[PDB]
Design a protein around this ligand. Structure first.
Ligand SMILES: OC[C@H]1O[C@@H](S[C@H]2[C@H](O)[C@@H](O)[C@H](O)O[C@@H]2CO)[C@H](O)[C@@H](O)[C@@H]1O
Ligand SMILES: CC(=O)N[C@@H]1[C@@H](O)[C@H](O)[C@@H](CO)O[C@H]1O
Ligand SMILES: *[C@@H]1O[C@H](CO)[C@@H](O)[C@H](O)[C@H]1NC(C)=O
Length: 602
């Protein structure tokens, strides 16, 4: 009664081949199908031999769910999968792209653009490490991260998910990968997948390729650039990912010179697989195959043929699994898609599952639950937040006293602005909900809370969200901290041609700073029109989307640490200049990539 694939002491490739040789067409196509937990039931998982599940943004068992509730959900799905004839465990994926961010009480790290400002790849690794633990705390084995897009136009609604417009910074930050997955061994072959074990997670380098180079930063659009620019800008970090053993790669919605990435056999098979020698699995984006056609979904039969022939291994359906499975089955049965293509896709999927130890530990570890939101992880996020801040101005004239760092002791201070006490706003998109949200959406410390935690007990802290000029002038304030900026957004909702922050933002800064010396904290996913905020402010800090740990902000405002962050993107003078990147011809920045003022700790 020995079955070689169930034997944990055998080599991964022997286990993969042994299992593959036993599988029916239905079992094989099943591996290739990922479905939303929203459509999953025990019978659906068993009857369709489903290979993977995901939670999309905001797909949660319930609002407020505990780590254990997540574990019990995942384990209930796994129980169903393990009960099939072959008992192939599912892999569960989720967008843990700045911590385990769909989950209440999870540590929310700064978004990527802020992490780019740190120039600290070891920090990002340690964030990968903490994120894996917080993901495994919820029973989940697979994170759709890192986004290694090189955003070339900040009008893109996902620019905050890019570490930098400079491919070299992005390349340096692929250290997230061995943080999430573990360090590959001495003699590792570039392109092979790797995950250390049950305390780590499979990663996903996304979105292949040129997602950050789209015309006018239009999300999911066309990236018009020759092979040499594709390979010089958008590709390099994928090779770094191969060298670090990234387990999966997700394909972009975007097109390259008019060809849909989800149908690009030359790039997916010819380049990623045959040239970079990637041996993990390639996954679609969410209804990515549907979007091959215009309109989307209008020829699903073609979407399945084109994508699987292009070299995609797993399809994030994620809802219409019966139609996907029926169509791919028919294509195989009719000789349109050879068995060799199915066998390759399934080889890769199983290779990742076996390598990461999923057949040995298919179920959650309840002892890991307490990793969620752990104070050591918050301290890390707080460090990252502080390191991400870029000080853009610290004095209206070169002769003024520097405003920062501020003194912790003063009779009375003002904290103001729409973003001074709003956790959701300081977290941005991909936090609790897909699009993010407003207000106290999870566990954290707002800027106002951090000020109160930082200041001398004699210091009276006044909060006013949008005070008028008279209120400020009459307040007897020593100084003000005013926080304003962008509202949370994701993907196309963030595509923005004007890049001016919503009002009241500017008007609040003008009223505050017109009455008292002010430090303006700008919360944004990207450079936004900033000359008017600058002209009003004594000091101004670009804080990006710093996450749950607002004490990172006050750590630098009050001089516990000096400002060290440096712009990871060009700050434009005007949106009419865009696209404009470091190294262009017409390069006329307000602040060049690399700019950032410093302070010393007090
Ligand atoms: O979340 C998986 C995958 O998604 C796309 S966006 C996805 C949201 O998760 C889902 O809740 C919403 O209704 O649909 C959107 C896309 O239309 C994303 O490009 C990718 O990075 C992410 O890993
Ligand atoms: C407040 C303060 O000390 N600022 C200084 C700066 O003027 C100087 O260039 C440097 C020397 O180490 O350290 C920092
Ligand atoms: C780019 O966006 C326009 C709408 O702005 C749309 O008509 C077109 O199909 C898009 N192209 C691609 C390749 O996504």
């Amino acid at each position: 009664d020995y079955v070689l694939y169930k034997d944990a002491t055998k080599p991964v490739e022997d286990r993969v081949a042994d299992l593959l040789g036993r599988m029916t067409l239905a079992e094989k196509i099943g591996q290739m199908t990922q479905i939303e937990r929203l459509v999953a039931t025990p019978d659906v998982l068993r009857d369709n031999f489903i290979g993977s599940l995901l939670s999309g943004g905001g797909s949660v068992p319930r609002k407020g769910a505990t780590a254990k509730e997540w574990q019990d959900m995942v384990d209930g799905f796994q129980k169903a999968c393990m009960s099939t004839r072959l008992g192939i465990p599912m892999i569960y994926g989720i967008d843990a792209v700045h911590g385990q961010n769909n989950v209440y009480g999870a540590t929310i790290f700064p978004h990527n653009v802020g992490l780019g400002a740190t120039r600290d790849p070891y920090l990002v690794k340690r964030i990968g490490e903490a994120t894996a633990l917080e993901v495994r705390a919820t029973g989940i084995q697979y994170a759709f991260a890192p986004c290694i897009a090189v955003c070339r136009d900040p009008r893109w609604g996902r620019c905050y998910e890019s570490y930098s417009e400079d491919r070299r910074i992005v390349q340096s930050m692929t250290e997230l990968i061995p943080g999430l997955q573990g360090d590959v061994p001495k003699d590792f072959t570039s392109g092979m997948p790797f995950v250390a074990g049950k305390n780590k997670v499979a990663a996903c380098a996304k979105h292949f390729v040129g997602d950050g180079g789209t015309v006018d930063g239009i999300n999911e659009n066309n990236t018009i650039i020759n092979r040499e620019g594709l390979m010089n800008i958008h590709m390099p970090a994928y090779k770094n990912a191969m060298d670090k053993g990234v387990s999966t790669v997700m394909i972009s919605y975007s097109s390259w010179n008019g060809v849909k990435m989800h149908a690009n056999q030359d790039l997916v098979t010819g380049y990623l697989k045959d040239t970079l020698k990637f041996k993990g699995f390639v996954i679609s984006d969410w209804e990515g195959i549907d979007r091959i056609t215009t309109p989307a979904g209008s020829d699903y039969s073609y979407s399945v043929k084109a994508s699987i022939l292009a070299g995609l291994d797993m399809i994030m359906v994620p809802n219409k699994y019966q139609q996907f499975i029926s169509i791919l089955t028919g294509h195989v049965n009719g000789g349109v898609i050879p068995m060799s293509r199915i066998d390759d896709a399934v080889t890769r999927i199983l290779r990742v599952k076996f390598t990461m130890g999923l057949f040995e530990n298919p179920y959650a570890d309840p002892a890991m639950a307490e990793q969620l939101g752990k104070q050591e992880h918050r301290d890390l996020a707080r460090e990252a937040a502080r390191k991400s801040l870029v000080l853009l101005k610290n004095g209206k004239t070169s002769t003024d006293a520097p405003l920062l760092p501020l003194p912790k002791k003063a009779p009375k201070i003002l904290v103001a602005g729409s973003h001074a006490d709003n956790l959701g706003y300081q977290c941005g998109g991909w936090t609790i909900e897909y699009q993010g949200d407003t207000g106290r959406t999870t566990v954290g410390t707002t800027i106002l809370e951090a000020v109160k935690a930082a200041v001398d007990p004699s210091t009276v802290v006044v909060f006013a969200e949008n005070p008028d000029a008279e209120f400020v002038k009459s307040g007897g304030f020593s100084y003000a901290i005013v926080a304003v900026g962008e509202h949370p957004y994701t993907e196309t909702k963030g595509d923005n041609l004007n890049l001016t922050i919503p009002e009241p933002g500017l008007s609040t800064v003008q009223a505050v700073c017109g009455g008292v010396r002010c430090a303006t904290v700008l919360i944004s996913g990207r450079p936004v029109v900033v000359q008017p905020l600058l002209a009003a402010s004594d000091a101004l800090v670009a804080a990006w989307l710093p996450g749950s740990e607002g004490q990172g902000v006050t750590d630098a405002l009050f001089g516990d640490f000096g400002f060290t962050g440096r712009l990871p993107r060009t700050w434009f003078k005007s949106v009419d200049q865009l696209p404009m990147n470091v190294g262009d011809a017409h390069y006329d920045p307000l602040f060049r990539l690399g700019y950032g003022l410093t302070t010393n700790a007090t």
